A paper describes a structure:
Bacteriophage-encoded depolymerases are highly specific enzymes, acting at the first step of phage infection and serve for specific recognition of host cell receptor, as well as for the degradation of polysaccharides. The polysaccharide-degrading enzymes are primarily virion-associated proteins like tail fibers, tailspikes, base plate or neck, whereas some are soluble proteins, released during bacterial lysis. These enzymes target structural polysaccharides (LPS, capsular polysaccharides, peptidoglycan) and essential components of the biofilm matrix.
Phage LKA1 encodes a trimeric tailspike protein (LKAgp49) with a typical conserved N-terminal structure-associated domain and an unconserved central and C-terminal region with predicted polysaccharide binding/degrading activity (Pfam 12708 and right-handed β-helices). For crystallization, the N-terminal particle-binding domain of LKAgp49 (residues 1–167) was removed. The resulting mutant – gp49d – constitutes a ‘catalytic module’ of the tailspike. Eventually, one crystal of gp49d gave a clean and isotropic diffraction pattern that extended to 1.9 Å resolution. Gp49d and gp61d display 32% amino acid sequence identity and can be superimposed with a root mean squared deviation of 1.6 Å between 572 (or 97%) equivalent C-alpha atoms. Gp49d can be divided into three domains: (1) a β-helix typical to many tailspikes (residues 181–283 and 371–675); (2) a β-barrel or an insertion domain that is positioned on a side of the β-helix and that interrupts the run of polypeptide chain comprising the β-helix (residues 284–370); and (3) a β-sandwich or jellyroll C-terminal domain (residues 676–769). The most conserved residues form an intricate system connected by hydrogen and ionic bonds with Asp497 coordinating His494 and His499. The three residues are likely to be the most important in the catalysis with Asp497 being the critical residue. A highly conserved Arg329 extends towards the active site where it forms a hydrogen bond with His499. Based on these data, it was concluded that the tailspike protein LKA1gp49 is a specific polysaccharide lyase.
Author numbering:
A (entry chain A), B (entry chain C): 181 to 769
C (entry chain B): 180 to 769
The structure:
Amino acid sequence: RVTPAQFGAVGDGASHPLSERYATLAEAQTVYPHAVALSDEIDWAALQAAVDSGAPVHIPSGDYQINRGISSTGSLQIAGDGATSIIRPTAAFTGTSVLSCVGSLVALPNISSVSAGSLTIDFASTPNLVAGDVFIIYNPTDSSFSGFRTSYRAGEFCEVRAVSGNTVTIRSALYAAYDGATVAIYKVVSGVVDIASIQIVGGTVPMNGLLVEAVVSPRVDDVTVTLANNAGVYFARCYDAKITNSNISNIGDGGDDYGIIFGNCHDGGADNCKVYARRHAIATGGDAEVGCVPVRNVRMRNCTLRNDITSGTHCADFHGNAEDCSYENCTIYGGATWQGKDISYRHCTITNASGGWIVISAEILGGTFLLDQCTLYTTGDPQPGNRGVIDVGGNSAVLTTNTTQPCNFLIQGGSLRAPSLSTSSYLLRARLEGSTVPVNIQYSGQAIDVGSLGKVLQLDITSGSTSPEYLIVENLAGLPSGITLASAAGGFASAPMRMPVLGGRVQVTTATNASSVTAPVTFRYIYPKAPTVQVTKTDRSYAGNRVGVAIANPTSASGATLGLFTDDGTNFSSAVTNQLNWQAGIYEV
Amino acid sequence: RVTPAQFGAVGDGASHPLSERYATLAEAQTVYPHAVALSDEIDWAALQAAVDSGAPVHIPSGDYQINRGISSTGSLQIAGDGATSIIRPTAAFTGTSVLSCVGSLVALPNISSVSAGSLTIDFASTPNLVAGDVFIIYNPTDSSFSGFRTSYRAGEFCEVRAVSGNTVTIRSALYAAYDGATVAIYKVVSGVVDIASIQIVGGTVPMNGLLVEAVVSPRVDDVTVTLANNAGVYFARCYDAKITNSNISNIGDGGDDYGIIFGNCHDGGADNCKVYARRHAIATGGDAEVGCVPVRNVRMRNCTLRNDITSGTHCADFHGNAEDCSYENCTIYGGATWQGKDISYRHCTITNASGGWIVISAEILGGTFLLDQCTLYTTGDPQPGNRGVIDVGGNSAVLTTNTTQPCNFLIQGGSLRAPSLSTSSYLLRARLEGSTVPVNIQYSGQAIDVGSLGKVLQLDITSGSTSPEYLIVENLAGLPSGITLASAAGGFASAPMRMPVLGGRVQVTTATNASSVTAPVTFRYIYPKAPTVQVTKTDRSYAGNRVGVAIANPTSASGATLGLFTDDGTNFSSAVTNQLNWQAGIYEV
Amino acid sequence: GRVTPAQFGAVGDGASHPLSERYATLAEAQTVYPHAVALSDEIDWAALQAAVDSGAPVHIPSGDYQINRGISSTGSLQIAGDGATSIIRPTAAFTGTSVLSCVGSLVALPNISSVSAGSLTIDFASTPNLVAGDVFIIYNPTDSSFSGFRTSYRAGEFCEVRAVSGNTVTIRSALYAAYDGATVAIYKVVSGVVDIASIQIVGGTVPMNGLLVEAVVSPRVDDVTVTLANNAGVYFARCYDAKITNSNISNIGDGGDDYGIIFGNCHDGGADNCKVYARRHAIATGGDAEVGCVPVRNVRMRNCTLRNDITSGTHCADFHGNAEDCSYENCTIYGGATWQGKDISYRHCTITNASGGWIVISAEILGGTFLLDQCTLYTTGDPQPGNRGVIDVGGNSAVLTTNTTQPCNFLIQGGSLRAPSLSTSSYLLRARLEGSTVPVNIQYSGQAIDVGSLGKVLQLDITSGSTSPEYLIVENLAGLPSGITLASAAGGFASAPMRMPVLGGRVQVTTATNASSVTAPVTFRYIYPKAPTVQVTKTDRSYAGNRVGVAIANPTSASGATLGLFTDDGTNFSSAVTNQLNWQAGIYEV
Ligand SMILES: [Ca+2]
Ligand SMILES: [Ca+2]
Ligand SMILES: [Ca+2]
Ligand SMILES: [Ca+2]
Ligand code: NA
Ligand code: NA
Ligand code: NA
Ligand code: NA
Ligand code: NA
Ligand code: NA
Ligand code: NA
Ligand code: NA
Ligand code: NA
Ligand code: NA
Ligand code: NA
Ligand code: NA
Ligand code: NA
Ligand code: NA
């Protein structure tokens, strides 16, 4: 509705300080009240004034030179003509973000204590809320959500359903319980944020290309952002923030170096974005400011993500304050991570990080962690660095005294290709370093393509202990002969186990000078302990004078000696074939 | 192209009746031929005149007060500057919908009878159709698609491939057969419908925020709609209706209370929308008007949905006239439903409705119903309401004489967390109330996280009968000891079954004063009938004078007495240990 | 956009207006439109072309613009309209290859040292004109350097620059393949902004393409409607991260290749939320034989509904054999789909049959992994009379040949497959060797099947060549009727490590006091590829008078077994009493 040209923008790609047009600061401020100095860029002055007008701003193709950030409280509405509508910080730029909009957390009355899964909140006095309003429940106590980091504090975003007196009902169930004496409540007050069809060429100075903070349903669509600093796009304390159809590339400056990060956000996500950043193309986390609650129901879909493989870290990120978030239908070059609680990767294609691993874990609070029908590729071998291809604390402190809820690690279907492992390598490692909770494993349905391999599961205990409900390896295709199904220490060894069935038909021939004949079997896979073995004689009835009793003696985790013995010890009177049909498995759960 | 300001709009948020500007109605009608009274809103008159010009309408930021719907026939093109372009019914509003566009159903010739799966339609005379045209085959006979409601009539939308004389080929196979003597055919005649980047604040009076009816490929994008009445967005009899990137919030007025509903629609769906509504955030169904055919190939993807949990109903809806529709990659707070035919939930996260159940059924015609790799949560327990966590007629008439096709209920992978069930609760219930078709269950691969639990399956018959092709429980993680695998009545009990394997190794020591030694085993899970049991002796050969024959006697659904007996009844001559390796399962299909 | 066709003199009223209506001479017309060719050219075309030529973004108001020549550009093309009422319409007099087109450039870079697959470092022979974010193509001009199935399936790929230090260029993702430095030419992709949105092209019968975008980084097509009766509604050629979204594309075809949207030699990007029809392939991938014709990689089709002409006899959803690491996800596909190339997946798709009755067909299999991941499949027909599986891998065509050079894994995981009209001779999946010598592995796992009659799950044949598979697995299937064959397996398939489902039951036998044995026959519900591993145990009786009896099976075969209870020493049983013979059978080799 307004343009920067209407407020005097030039936008020709060259510098135009206000001094080119105004002899005095007072004269410049008569036109641009918030100009700071005559050396400020006319393009910046014009863009900021247009934003300040309160009308949606349309930015025609041009190359706008700015020395300060374009910022707003409340609302920010900017739409360009596409990638040719360029906002470009100059070498003289100062400020935290190229574009920014910041809403408000406004104190609400305190509340009564409330249980997890409730949809009713009792305020101490009349709350200024109506249906559709958004508020944050916030616990200022350090580590109130997770002990892994100080800043992982508890709370969540609620959406008002109805209000009756001091009672406020909400539109979806609470993720967590709150003691009323420990939380402060804030109404999220913000205007309309919609940023579309522009290109930010941020350079090396600003920390963020775009910052949107404490806003309900901001929208970023069809943008291009390049930067060499901390974050291409940073959503902080936003509810239903969406960024869609955008290309974000952050070369980094050697800091946290994020492409798109959702800090203390709830709902929304990224859809159909192509993203590169040095460390984490997409990430979740937050800060330590008021309202720094966990990241929940944030969904990354249909993106392609790349990072700098030499950074050594995972490309797709969640930090340990995430709960109930996922990457879905994403192509992820350079690895992914399980952190926090209740995290899923669904139908993603994921390649390895530099260490050779594909999925790595950290800061596991507990809950369920899932690789759902993913396609996994590694060109390396993480075993020399003590990690699994899917790693849970192999060489790091991940399952600790800060892991306070039972954990379920679920690998369902999909495929895993890893041509360059050794006979020492393992597909999944979990190592306890202080936790005392059940750690359950379901490794199920996946098709595996390897050269050499040592083991499917490697389950270790450095400190702490576990009593799992289950330890399951099942329906795997592509396992080569000789591998170990699960090395399991301590409480993993005594866990209720299900292990794959092996078996076959072994011919034995009786001898007329003996009451028995035996034959050795070496299992194609090594079990964690002696499996449950069946043996049955087929394809012969009387071997002369006796049927014979089929047994196995001994049996072990690695094999068994099959035998056919006359019950009473009489020698067989004929020398003839018999088929010993054997099988082995473990079926405790 | 045109703006309401050009036609005299004010849009400042206050009321401006025509009387402010025109002394008589005649005077006003010179400018606005459609004006009804001098009390009409200038903003309404202006917006309607803008629509009536036939040019695309751009609505600049503004708050436009209207007392009547903005409506059109055939085409409607409205685009604003985003959420600050607000259309607002006043207290005096009269009309059914805030914005609406209605296309036409134009008679085509009758047709010859045609079979399901055909791509060739024979018209009785020359049809006015060319490639790309869309028509509806419509059976006006009540319940011609489904007997569950009279308005579930048969027919479908067809897209013309080629026309040769009176023969019309179509671009995809027919879903159903039609007797030519029973159907009337209608060409869908409509123009361009495109509604984008506006906000409708509908209030309590209009039944619909947006209504689009009988239109080919209408588009709704980047809109925000709030309402407290029947439907935020209602697509009726549309082909390839698509709504994208929109936020829809219907507080409801205590009726059907839908967010987005697709009535009698084919193709299209909802993508990347955040939706709240009191009863069903998204739904499908229809009315009883001409062309009220089944809802097909409508796909809801990448949405977050919420409802009022106190409504007691499911948040994500399909009615019984749905065929071949799905929700995929959606976050669903407040439950989902199987109804109609061939319905799936894929990679969704779903929480419980107030009853404690998560997926509920109604109006099952038959076909295949799938929960594919979904993450399911319930904080409650549906068993006291006689419902499973996944429920098929537990407490309602769902599998009845109106269920006319074989049913397959499939649960594949994913997870289910339900910490608060009792030892009486069951994960899935199916109860017959009059149906006679096969009802097949595949409960396969899911990771389960419970405290107490009674049963995996509960399969009951109040009336009717069934001869299932299969009844399968397999590859489940997380089942606690003592649960029942399936309680199965009548034809469920005699169905070909597959039930999980349990087994173990039990040490027994022979005694020199007996020919046998036994040991009791109680299975971890209770089978629906005595399972198929194997026992083999290992890790010992002769026990003095005899090997011993390993048997089980008795066996039952809940356990077995393992035994080692000398074949000839001679007492064992030595007291030595032996391992009885036992296992059980059911392997009929 | 900045400029409009009106500003350059357009009419856009739907009727023809040759330049001769306004200008008496060609010279006078060219004063206004320098690139007009003749006074008979359309004013709408001259105006639209001039608007594009201005270099400003072009906004096209509602109107119906008549053009007799393509609207084209080099480097950049920015066009946005008011939606489907902004119509660009070739006239009967149209001449040109494409209605709308933008072509970027491939600019030679220095040569590189040999590099391994999986590398992220490239060494240039001399200083390269590259910075971070730049895109280049490694190209091998040698015919069939990626796949032997076609000449034009040449090797190479798109790389995105991470950093440059001296002659060393690091890249943002690992190379898919290895390259001999002496065999490749390297090219920078130089292009500007391409953005086409919110217009309708009514192409007609003349143009080969509705929209062509060639050699461009991140072109964007959004909210467009395209109809045509020729070769390709939308053709992306040698593009990196081409995205078409929210569009309706319909190609009636002219009897040629007849594509809706085709990605030729493209890397990254894909199609999202599109409704597409084309006579042959609604969406396809492939390419041409021009410089830079590299494999199609990381192209993702998502959230689309696709239809084709079923009487064409071909699959609706296409990849050609030069595809690697591509997929369809969350698509409704009427008229079948295909596995070709390497590492291809369909995920959460609903797919119906092509005319032959099959649903997924293969061709030009290089090797790697081919996945149907939780798909819903439906056929109204039966492909067996045409010698093809419902899921087919060379049943009646040359698919697994000397050009299949890498181990193949065919995976069917979960989902459902309904096929009510098969016969007792039909098979769900067929794979047939016609010259390949690599392992061919099958995982058929977890699917719920709904059939009337059926012959077999797998039909594994060898016409020529040979195979030593790592695995052959059938497991966790629901809905198989009695009497089917699990796997017909010939040659090396027959000797592969197999996993086959368990069958079992409890059979009552009563001893006789005048014999030392009692037997009972069992016929398995499914026929195994070879004699299965069988267990038998006696339950629910201890001594039958004087003896327990030893439970065995004799004989056993692929189709059944004779269960037996025999006193060990051949003494007659002394009592006639019941016993339960608990039997089971399966194959458990992998
Ligand atoms: Ca390594
Ligand atoms: Ca309940
Ligand atoms: Ca035995
Ligand atoms: Ca056929
Ligand atoms: Na000042
Ligand atoms: Na100054
Ligand atoms: Na503002
Ligand atoms: Na609301
Ligand atoms: Na911290
Ligand atoms: Na012999
Ligand atoms: Na009147
Ligand atoms: Na068409
Ligand atoms: Na002993
Ligand atoms: Na001329
Ligand atoms: Na860059
Ligand atoms: Na060729
Ligand atoms: Na072929
Ligand atoms: Na008896």
